């Protein structure tokens, strides 16, 4: 039923209100997701002027319900199962040798649109560090998001490490701790351990005057295999 909502192309909107070391900002985003292909296309604009942090640091914050779950893993898709009422997604993002983001978001349908509404608080950043000093390259690596069930909270937890390329050729680690909990009362799928394999590409809109980021993402779940017998049946 939740999965039925994602069989075609679904329009997406994003809102973020942020405050990093006392620098307040807002972002809005729009695009679409095609969970059949695990495909996301999104464009974000800073509505308050110039973004006070590098665009790449906000990628993970700005809809894992669009993941492509292979047929044999459909019982492990918590994200879709919580729709349309949606889920709360909370994170701590710890930049190594630098500050932290603290995020809370609601992801849910508003009409036929999947909407991600976020607040972000940032603290303990170095004015001359990679983040406030804007020393990140405008690009993105590929990462695995490791998911485990959190039966107590009737949801999931995830942990992963984002690697941000720094202009001098080093890498800035951003350790991600994540939890998701359904908004609704209905039953949801509590998964076995697995991961989302994620590729992201950042670009610019040549016609866009605002501070902005264009994102193209492909997300496919993995880490759970067919049984041996299923492999023989598939082969035949």
């Amino acid at each position: 039923k939740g999965e039925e909502l994602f069989t075609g192309v679904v329009p997406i909107l994003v809102x973020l209100d942020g405050d990093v070391n006392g620098h307040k900002f807002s972002v809005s985003g729009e695009g679409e997701g095609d969970a059949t292909y695990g495909k996301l296309t999104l464009k974000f604009i800073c509505t308050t002027g110039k973004l006070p942090v590098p665009w790449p640091t906000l990628v993970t914050t700005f809809v894992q319900c669009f993941s492509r779950y292979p047929d044999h893993m459909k019982r492990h898709d918590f994200f879709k199962s919580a729709m349309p009422e949606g889920y709360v997604q909370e994170r701590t993002i710890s930049f190594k040798d630098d500050g932290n983001y603290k995020t809370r978001a609601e992801v849910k349908f508003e009409g036929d649109t999947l909407v991600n509404r976020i607040e972000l608080k940032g603290i303990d950043f170095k004015e001359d560090g990679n983040i406030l000093g804007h020393k990140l390259e405008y690009n993105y690596n590929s990462h695995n998001v490791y998911i485990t069930a959190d039966k107590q909270k009737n949801g999931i937890k995830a942990n992963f490490k984002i690697r941000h390329n720094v202009e001098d050729g080093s890498v800035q680690l951003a350790d991600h701790y994540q939890q998701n909990t359904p908004i609704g009362d209905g039953p949801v799928l509590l998964p076995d351990n697995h991961y989302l394999s994620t590729q992201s590409a950042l670009s610019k809109d040549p016609n866009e005057k605002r501070d902005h980021m264009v994102l193209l993402e492909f997300v496919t779940a993995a880490g759970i295999t067919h049984g041996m017998d299923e492999l023989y049946k598939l082969e035949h």
Side-chain angles (χ1 to χ4, degrees), residues 80-139:
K80 295 186 191 54
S81 79
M83 294 299 164
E85 263 124 291
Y87 52 80
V88 170
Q89 176 160 300
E90 289 160 312
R91 287 222 182 89
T92 299
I93 306 165
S94 168
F95 295 88
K96 187 171 138 80
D97 298 325
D98 211 337
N100 277 34
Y101 295 159
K102 189 86 182 154
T103 71
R104 181 181 192 277
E106 288 186 4
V107 187
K108 70 188 168 283
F109 279 87
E110 300 177 4
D112 296 327
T113 309
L114 186 286
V115 184
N116 183 18
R117 295 182 170 283
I118 312 149
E119 59 185 312
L120 178 149
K121 283 273 194 205
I123 203 181
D124 294 323
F125 284 94
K126 289 159 187 184
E127 28 79 41
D128 57 321
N130 291 328
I131 294 87
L132 289 188
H134 293 260
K135 308 190 182 172
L136 264 75
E137 294 189 343
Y138 190 73
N139 54 30

Side-chain angles (χ1 to χ4, degrees), residues 23 46 51 86 114 122 135 142 148:
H23 305 282
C46 181
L51 198 70
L114 186 286
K135 308 190 182 172
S142 305
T148 188

